Amino acid sequence: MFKAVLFDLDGVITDTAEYHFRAWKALAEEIGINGVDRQFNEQLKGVSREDSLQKILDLADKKVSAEEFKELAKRKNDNYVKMIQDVSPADVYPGILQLLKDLRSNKIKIALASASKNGPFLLERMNLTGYFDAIADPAEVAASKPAPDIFIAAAHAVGVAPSESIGLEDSQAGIQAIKDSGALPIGVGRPEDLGDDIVIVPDTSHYTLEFLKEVWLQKQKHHH
Ligand SMILES: [Ca+2]
Ligand SMILES: [Ca+2]
Ligand SMILES: [Ca+2]
Ligand SMILES: [Ca+2]
């Protein structure tokens, strides 16, 4: 039986897409740039802060010094970190809270493998910290997804082998990081985005303890 489940945060437990979009829009109006609307926001999602700020600059071909650039990126981040004060347990995606309870009560290790420096805060906003045995610190991990280190550190932090672990992710880079760590990925999303090879469910309500056991047992049979 698997001994740990390794959770990404964004797109598995919740998302904060409205908060990012609000923060980006506030930043762009402050610097008198227009055209950061919802369709344009689709380009910012999941992208690094620096690349998103560059996309917003190119809307006006505005050029800035490196200190201004760093200042603008921090301004958006400070504003977003203030906005996620309002995250609450009602933001947890369907199926997730019950899955965490079932793992905890089954004594299966639960770890967070998220790139976000806001992971601890967001889990506390959602009243989930009690379920998480460890949170891999993204600052301590030099190589980010699709490199497997964040997931390797997550498995180690709870004292299980990655090969004893299932990883949950909604992004291709995360699915690849889970693969390369040796844990077993179960994607949530579409195979057009995540690949035709892994086990995939369309939405998080499929993430049940019973379904993960089905995927695990079926992986153990594959030998052979
Ligand atoms: Ca993700
Ligand atoms: Ca999504
Ligand atoms: Ca909840
Ligand atoms: Ca709380």
Tab-separated table of C-alpha atoms in Angstrom, residues 103-212:
chain	number	residue	atom	x	y	z
A	103	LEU	CA	-5.769	9.624	4.626
A	104	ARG	CA	-5.179	11.015	8.105
A	105	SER	CA	-7.537	8.588	9.770
A	106	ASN	CA	-5.917	5.805	7.693
A	107	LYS	CA	-2.421	6.940	8.897
A	108	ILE	CA	-1.221	7.681	5.373
A	109	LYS	CA	1.347	10.487	5.289
A	110	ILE	CA	0.178	13.771	3.711
A	111	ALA	CA	2.731	16.241	2.298
A	112	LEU	CA	2.546	19.491	0.304
A	113	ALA	CA	4.830	19.792	-2.759
A	114	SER	CA	4.048	23.287	-3.963
A	115	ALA	CA	6.183	25.981	-5.509
A	116	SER	CA	4.272	28.720	-3.700
A	117	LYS	CA	5.997	30.511	-0.826
A	118	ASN	CA	2.403	31.142	0.327
A	119	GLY	CA	1.625	27.450	0.820
A	120	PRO	CA	1.676	27.504	4.639
A	121	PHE	CA	-0.553	30.584	4.812
A	122	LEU	CA	-3.058	29.304	2.229
A	123	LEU	CA	-3.398	25.966	4.033
A	124	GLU	CA	-4.016	27.832	7.296
A	125	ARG	CA	-6.619	30.061	5.571
A	126	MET	CA	-8.375	26.851	4.465
A	127	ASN	CA	-8.062	25.236	7.923
A	128	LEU	CA	-6.018	22.341	6.450
A	129	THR	CA	-2.738	22.576	8.417
A	130	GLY	CA	-3.874	19.820	10.794
A	131	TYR	CA	-3.884	17.296	7.912
A	132	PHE	CA	-0.393	18.057	6.561
A	133	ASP	CA	2.520	16.140	8.058
A	134	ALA	CA	5.048	18.252	6.150
A	135	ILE	CA	5.329	21.178	3.709
A	136	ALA	CA	8.323	21.122	1.381
A	137	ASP	CA	9.848	24.582	1.476
A	138	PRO	CA	10.140	25.807	-2.158
A	139	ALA	CA	12.878	28.285	-1.212
A	140	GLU	CA	15.027	25.414	0.057
A	141	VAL	CA	14.608	23.586	-3.301
A	142	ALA	CA	16.781	25.100	-6.035
A	143	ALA	CA	15.343	23.234	-9.046
A	144	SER	CA	11.645	23.744	-9.749
A	145	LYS	CA	9.121	21.717	-11.796
A	146	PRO	CA	9.420	19.760	-14.015
A	147	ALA	CA	12.492	18.803	-11.886
A	148	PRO	CA	11.503	16.222	-9.240
A	149	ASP	CA	13.248	17.821	-6.235
A	150	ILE	CA	10.178	19.416	-4.645
A	151	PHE	CA	8.443	16.065	-4.687
A	152	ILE	CA	11.560	14.237	-3.512
A	153	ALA	CA	11.862	16.646	-0.584
A	154	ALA	CA	8.147	16.250	0.165
A	155	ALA	CA	8.428	12.459	0.322
A	156	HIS	CA	11.595	12.633	2.467
A	157	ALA	CA	10.100	15.187	4.849
A	158	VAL	CA	7.477	12.586	5.839
A	159	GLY	CA	9.981	9.679	5.858
A	160	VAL	CA	8.620	7.669	2.910
A	161	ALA	CA	10.236	6.619	-0.341
A	162	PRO	CA	8.850	8.347	-3.458
A	163	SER	CA	8.244	4.852	-4.848
A	164	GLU	CA	5.869	4.427	-1.863
A	165	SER	CA	4.108	7.703	-2.816
A	166	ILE	CA	1.258	8.991	-4.991
A	167	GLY	CA	1.502	12.562	-6.289
A	168	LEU	CA	-1.480	14.734	-7.210
A	169	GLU	CA	-1.051	17.477	-9.815
A	170	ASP	CA	-3.014	19.429	-12.435
A	171	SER	CA	-0.048	20.710	-14.487
A	172	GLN	CA	2.159	19.006	-17.008
A	173	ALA	CA	5.354	20.227	-15.318
A	174	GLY	CA	4.128	18.836	-11.994
A	175	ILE	CA	3.100	15.501	-13.502
A	176	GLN	CA	6.610	15.178	-14.972
A	177	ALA	CA	8.205	16.087	-11.601
A	178	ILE	CA	6.160	13.368	-9.883
A	179	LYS	CA	7.272	10.903	-12.570
A	180	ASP	CA	10.928	11.734	-12.235
A	181	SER	CA	10.764	11.477	-8.460
A	182	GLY	CA	9.545	7.848	-8.716
A	183	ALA	CA	6.183	8.557	-7.125
A	184	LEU	CA	2.958	7.604	-8.893
A	185	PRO	CA	1.136	10.546	-10.557
A	186	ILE	CA	-2.613	10.844	-10.786
A	187	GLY	CA	-3.452	13.890	-12.873
A	188	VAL	CA	-6.544	16.045	-12.598
A	189	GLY	CA	-7.392	17.645	-15.931
A	190	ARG	CA	-7.448	16.673	-19.618
A	191	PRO	CA	-5.109	14.270	-21.383
A	192	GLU	CA	-4.594	16.918	-24.104
A	193	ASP	CA	-2.795	18.924	-21.381
A	194	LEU	CA	-1.399	16.167	-19.111
A	195	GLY	CA	-0.633	13.280	-21.489
A	196	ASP	CA	-2.315	10.034	-22.576
A	197	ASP	CA	0.002	7.809	-20.454
A	198	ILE	CA	-0.820	8.614	-16.783
A	199	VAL	CA	-3.913	7.951	-14.736
A	200	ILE	CA	-6.085	11.063	-14.986
A	201	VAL	CA	-9.379	12.153	-13.483
A	202	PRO	CA	-11.361	15.107	-14.947
A	203	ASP	CA	-11.904	16.962	-11.628
A	204	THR	CA	-10.894	16.623	-7.987
A	205	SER	CA	-14.130	14.944	-6.868
A	206	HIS	CA	-12.611	11.783	-8.352
A	207	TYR	CA	-9.749	12.084	-5.805
A	208	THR	CA	-11.090	9.556	-3.257
A	209	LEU	CA	-9.167	7.281	-0.956
A	210	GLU	CA	-10.950	4.315	-2.584
A	211	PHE	CA	-10.012	5.468	-6.106
A	212	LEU	CA	-6.348	5.987	-5.146
